[PDB]
């Protein structure tokens, strides 16, 4: 509580990406394995990283099976790394809009967030 928040990324095209702050209020660990949203057909769960090829340093991205958050702790889907990919959007979405995410937590759980959309 503070921020604790996120934003969905601008795109008028077929796909987008989403960044957000995961926080665990429980005494047991939470584990984010999936998601949902009213502005996609697929969600996918991704990482992002720095990488070397030929001694020349670039960035890259991959899908991943889940994220972990320890009890009383927090971890963001940060723009310098982990994020959802949203594909098959239902608003062509843009700076100053408004979007839900649903976050599928391991063993019978879910969290809902509401995020703004940003040209970020």
Residues lying near Cu ion in the complex (CB under 5 A) are found at 46, 61, 85
Q: How far is the CB of 47 from Cu ion (least distance, A)?
A: 8
Give me the least distance between CB of 97 and Cu ion, in Å please: 19
Q: Which lies closer to Cu ion via its Cβ, residue 24 or residue 35?
A: 35
Question: C-beta of 58: minimal distance to Cu ion in Å?
Answer: 15
Q: Nearer to Cu ion by C-beta: 55 or 63?
A: 63
Q: How far is the CB of 63 from Cu ion (least distance, A)?
A: 8
> Which is nearer to Cu ion, 39 or 85 (by Cβ)?
85
Considering beta carbons, is residue 46 or 91 the nearer one to Cu ion?
A: 46
Using H for helix, E for strand and C for coil, what is the string for the chain?
A: CCCCCEEEECECCCEEEEEEEEECCCCCCEEEEEEECCCCCEEEEEEEEEEEECCEEEEEEEECCCEEECCCCEEEECCCCCEEEEECCCCCECCCCEEEEEEEECCCEEEEEEEEEECC
The answer to whether the CB of 19 falls within 8 A of the CB of 77 is: yes
């Amino acid at each position: 509580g503070s921020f604790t928040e996120g934003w969905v990324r601008f795109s008028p095209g077929p796909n987008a990406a989403a960044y957000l702050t995961l926080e665990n209020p429980g005494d047991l660990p939470l584990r984010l394995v999936g998601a949902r949203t009213p502005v996609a057909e697929r969600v996918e769960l991704h990482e992002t990283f720095m990488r070397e090829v030929e001694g020349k340093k670039v960035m890259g991205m991959r899908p991943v099976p889940f994220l972990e958050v320890p009890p009383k702790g927090r971890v963001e889907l940060k723009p310098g790394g982990y994020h959802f990919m949203l594909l098959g959007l239902k608003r062509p979405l843009k700076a100053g809009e408004e979007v839900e995410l649903d976050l599928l937590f391991a063993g019978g759980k879910v969290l809902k967030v509401v995020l703004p959309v940003e040209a970020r």
